[PDB]
């Protein structure tokens, strides 16, 4: 073997130029697609909030049009999924993870139009779903589509182009090129065996989609939190505790998402009409809350800067938290096309702030600023539920640019992944794939 | 399939023993990195004090500068050549071998050799980084605990070795994230699955990073301040800069390998001609560490300066070439030390220079040479050692200019792409490939 290794070392990092250039076209397509999606969502939320003015007088007619609009768009979303692409439901990350394992098809000719327009409906309707889901899956499929269109043969190409499309998909969702690469090499990739995924190829794709993102989203961060304070060493233990909390809650939150997945399957028993209508109800519920309590509906990005600043009261945070735990579950578990990734950032932030507030009054000598805990917790839920800490820590960093909080951030996210491991929790994306992969057998 | 399902449901379940031991490892590595770092600083200090007492009479102090660096350098080469040949050079290629189960981890030898050995070369003012010493001392620390607690299994051997290495990188640059990315992008077995627990590496990194912070807080390794931003119509320039780093990467590799051979002749492997050669190169570095500091030393000192545009174009070219020479002499000479940090310095300087030229060619871009400096800082690490992701993240963690992320990624990627298309190879792999082959031959 020592003789083979030598042969391999001398041959390391030599990715077929075809794969590299195709990683470029993919990244570019994924980025343009993420922009389009992002724009469509924004346009719909616009139209909807534009309707709530033509009826801002008759309050009852208003709470009605808010609901109907969100319901009609949500239903349209659930429909497209249930009718033309069942796989394009929920996140899509699990699904793409399956494809990397060669255990799930990448029906791009179906998913692309379904996941795009479908999410446009659910996200554009104000539902508690992130863009990650739609973009990472659209990304992967974009990667497959190019593979098929150029008949690029050979494992490496199939796995690499799929993995880049996924990374580019994540990158363009949060404007985080590094998180997109780390996501692939820590979570998306086959977790138990070697793989022929070219990191350098993923990079190119990410870069390309990130540039596409920048070409249309210049000068306006997704989350501007400003420069928070620093974190003294004698303050670190507090972030461990916060990690321990995210850690015991991570698994629990997973049980709920999986449980709620079942519990909600009953309401329609898989019936496309009871589903579409159930989703239409959940959708309408979100558009409603998106006017009587916005912080409980929508993606959640908006409330992050606010919570980090310490502008919410302890009471409002608990309200927002619980309410979002409910709206996230209802939207994601219901199988609506959308991610649960961003929603978790919001939950993490809120929880983190709340922890911080308490920390502040308990330790004035620490000169704390609840916001450092908000940031520390922002990716902690992604650490305890998804179990992809490195990707979370790096994602938060790329979005909140407060690198001096790196230790606290690592300590919280690590505390989370440690407590989520020691309380029986499982990588939520794996658990979902493990279910879909089982339901693909069980029925035989 | 049914297998996978069984695995998914069992994913991320690392034996609590491994995790707790990763913590002790990290803590030890960090405490070690601190001790090493302090020793180097103390020696460079003493050397400084010796010149003040013999300040008058230039030729006298130019002599004591040389001797002191020579005497410490020889002491360094000796300890390596005599008690641990493997603890020479970087140590990273070596540790990479161990992760492959292709090289031993003689910690009872390497720890004291690499530590006190590097103390001599680094403390003497040579052009070598701390990464080499710390990453290797790290892995060995990781092996030492595995052995002392008779922990059994692959996972534990690979994990504790991997974490000790990451913690080793982390405590060298105060970059926990680089430490982790290095292992999962460069260090780890590059062609087959491995039982390395990321979560365990994390804990170790954190623990050594905290150890670092308990002794170095309030003083960044590299303070460059907040640089300007980078317009999109400015990105192509970073591609070009990456293309340059990419053609120079392989070339710089050939020189390091070639200079390894060319220098082997001077002593033919003879411990005495080696120790004396090293004693010469060492003395040469402590001499330059008084008649042209920017050509000797680790190079960290000139990064902030060069990024600020405080060097003239001429001074940069001088510094560059001079450093290309001193880096090669110190590293290729097999002295215990890293070539990692020195490459940061070269990347910087080269970057600045590119910048300055960019500034005058495009006033409409309102460029600031320093953004190219930072883009290049990890670009050599990207063209030579081919670990871009770790480079980009390392620069970020040290320069804290995240708005330069696209430029940085574009330069580093341009580098790894051109280094690939010009036949270059991962310098750490090429070195291991040499070692591994020179063994079965």
């Amino acid at each position, epitope marked *: 073997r020592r003789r083979q290794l030598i042969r391999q070392l001398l041959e390391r990092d030599k990715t077929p130029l075809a794969i590299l250039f195709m990683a470029a076209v993919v990244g570019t397509l994924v980025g343009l697609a993420a922009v389009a999606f992002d724009k469509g969502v924004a346009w719909l939320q616009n139209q909807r909030m534009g309707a709530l003015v033509h009826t801002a007088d008759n309050y009852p007619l208003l709470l009605t049009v808010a609901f109907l609009c969100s319901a009609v768009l949500a239903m349209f979303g659930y429909f497209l999924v249930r009718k033309y692409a069942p796989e394009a439901g929920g996140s899509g990350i699990p699904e793409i993870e399956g494809a990397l394992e060669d255990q799930r098809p990448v029906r791009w000719w179906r998913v692309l139009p379904v996941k795009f327009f479908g999410g446009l409906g659910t996200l554009g309707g104000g539902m508690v779903l992130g863009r990650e889901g739609p973009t990472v899956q659209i990304g992967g499929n974009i990667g497959r589509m190019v593979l098929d269109i150029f008949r690029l043969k050979g494992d490496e190409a199939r796995h690499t182009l799929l993995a880049t499309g996924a990374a580019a998909g994540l990158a363009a969702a949060f404007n985080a090129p590094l998180a997109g690469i780390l996501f692939i090499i820590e979570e998306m990739r086959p977790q138990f065996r070697y793989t022929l995924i070219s990191i350098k190829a993923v990079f190119i794709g990410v870069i390309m989609s990130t540039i596409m993102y920048r070409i249309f989203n210049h000068e306006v961060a997704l989350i501007d939190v400003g420069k928070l*304070s620093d974190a003294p*060493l004698n303050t670190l233990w507090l972030y461990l505790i916060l990690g321990i909390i995210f850690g015991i809650f991570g698994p629990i939150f997973n049980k709920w998402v999986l449980g709620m997945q079942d519990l909600l399957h009953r309401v329609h028993g898989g019936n496309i009409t009871k589903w579409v209508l159930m989703g239409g109800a959940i959708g309408g519920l979100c558009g409603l809350l998106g006017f009587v309590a916005p912080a409980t509906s929508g993606g959640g990005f908006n409330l992050i800067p606010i919570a980090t600043a310490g502008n919410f009261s302890m009471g409002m945070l608990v309200f927002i938290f619980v309410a979002r735990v409910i709206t996230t579950l209802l939207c994601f578990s219901s199988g609506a096309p959308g991610g649960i990734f961003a929603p978790m950032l919001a939950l993490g932030t809120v929880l983190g702030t709340a922890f911080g507030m308490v920390a502040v009054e308990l330790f004035p*000598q620490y*000169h704390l*600023e609840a916001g450092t805990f908000a940031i520390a917790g922002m990716g902690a839920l992604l650490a305890a539920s998804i179990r992809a800490p490195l990707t979370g820590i790096i994602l938060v960093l790329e979005m909140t640019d407060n690198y001096q909080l790196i230790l606290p951030m690592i300590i919280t996210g690590l505390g989370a992944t440690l407590l989520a491991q020691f309380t029986g929790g499982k990588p939520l994306y794996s658990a979902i794939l493990a279910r879909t992969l089982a339901k693909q057998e069980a029925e035989q | 399939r049914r297998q996978l399902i069984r695995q998914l449901l069992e994913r991320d379940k690392t034996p609590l023993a491994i995790l707790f031991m990763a913590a002790v490892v990290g803590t030890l590595v960090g405490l070690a990195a601190v001790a090493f770092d302090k020793g180097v600083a103390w020696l460079q200090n003493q050397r400084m004090g010796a010149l003040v007492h013999t300040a008058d009479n230039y030729p006298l102090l130019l002599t004591v500068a040389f001797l002191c660096s020579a005497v410490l350098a020889m002491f360094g080469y000796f300890l390596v050549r005599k008690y641990a040949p493997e603890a020479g050079g970087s140590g990273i290629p070596e540790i990479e071998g161990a992760l492959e189960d292709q090289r031993p981890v003689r910690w009872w030898r390497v720890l004291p050799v690499k530590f006190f050995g590097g103390l001599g070369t680094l403390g003497g003012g040579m052009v070598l980084g701390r990464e080499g010493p710390t990453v290797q001392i790290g892995g060995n620390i990781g092996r030492m605990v595995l052995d002392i607690f008779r922990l059994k299994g692959d996972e534990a051997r690979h994990t504790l070795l991997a974490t000790g290495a990451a913690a080793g990188l982390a405590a060298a640059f105060n970059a926990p994230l680089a430490g982790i990315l290095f292992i999962i992008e460069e260090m780890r077995p590059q062609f087959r699955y491995t039982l390395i627990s990321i979560k365990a590496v994390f804990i170790g990194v954190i623990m050594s990073t905290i150890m670092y912070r*308990i002794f170095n807080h309030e003083v960044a390794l590299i303070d460059v301040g907040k640089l300007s931003d980078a317009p999109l119509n400015t990105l192509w320039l970073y591609l070009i800069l990456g293309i340059i780093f990419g053609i120079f990467g392989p070339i710089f590799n050939k020189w390091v390998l070639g200079m390894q051979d060319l220098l082997h002749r001077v002593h033919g492997g003879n411990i005495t001609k080696w120790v004396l050669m090293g004693g010469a190169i060492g003395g040469l570095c402590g001499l330059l560490g008084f008649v042209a500091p920017a050509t000797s030393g680790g190079g960290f000192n000139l990064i902030p300066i060069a990024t600020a545009g405080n060097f003239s174009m001429g001074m940069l070219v001088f510094i560059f070439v001079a450093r290309v020479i001193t880096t090669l002499l110190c590293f290729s000479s097999g002295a215990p030390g890293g070539i990692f940090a020195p490459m940061l310095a070269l990347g910087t300087v080269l970057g600045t220079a590119f910048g300055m030229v960019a500034v005058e060619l495009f006033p409409q871009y309102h460029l600031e040479a320093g953004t190219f400096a930072i883009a290049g800082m990890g670009a050599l690490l990207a063209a030579s050692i081919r670990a871009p992701l770790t480079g980009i993240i390392l620069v970020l963690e040290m320069t804290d200019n995240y708005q330069l992320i696209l430029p940085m990624i574009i330069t580093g990627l341009g580098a790894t792409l051109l280094a690939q298309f010009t036949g270059g190879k991962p310098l750490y792999s090429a070195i291991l490939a040499r070692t591994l082959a020179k063994q079965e031959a």
Partner: antibody
Amino acid sequence: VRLLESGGGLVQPGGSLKLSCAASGFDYSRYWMSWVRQAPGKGLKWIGEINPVSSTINYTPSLKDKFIISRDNAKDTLYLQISKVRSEDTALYYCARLYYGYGYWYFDVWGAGTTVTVSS
Amino acid sequence: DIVLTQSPAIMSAAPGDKVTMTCSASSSVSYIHWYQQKSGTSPKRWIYDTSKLTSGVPVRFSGSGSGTSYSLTINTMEAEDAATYYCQQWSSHPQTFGGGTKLEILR
């Protein structure tokens, strides 16, 4: 780094005065500012502190509104209003930038201080 | 709030001499700081986190202690060492100061 506090002087009992502290030589923000005072021939005593964004302002255990520490980062100036001034308030007042090593904060840099005399 | 009591309230020691002053706390404290105050000038952070010297403080100066007893020490106290030293804690809020110790040049 310089801290120049002014405003001190003679104040009639029951009166109120506003002490000022002009900061220069560093980014006034990022820093928690604090007032401390030293009564003639006696020890130091913390008055209170104010974080960078004025979101937090703590005072030594004392009369509800006896002290009002405010700051204007736009003028890089710290302020200390004292009310219902009594002899106990006669003292040298120091503004001090706050910082820390391991995390147990200290009074990083102090100014020369302004003397306050409470008398009729 | 924590009461810091500095042992010798006043002490005299000739130049070149091991001088040691105590700072006892009513309760438990950690990483106390020390400030030097020369007649007519503002207090100066001398020693912090129990034993770290502030940049510029001669090495003859050292400090140590723990729990409820700390001390600042001068190995060979120079002339420009005459001053009042105040210990301060903030391991507990609100921070408190010692009554101070006046170091005078015995002659």
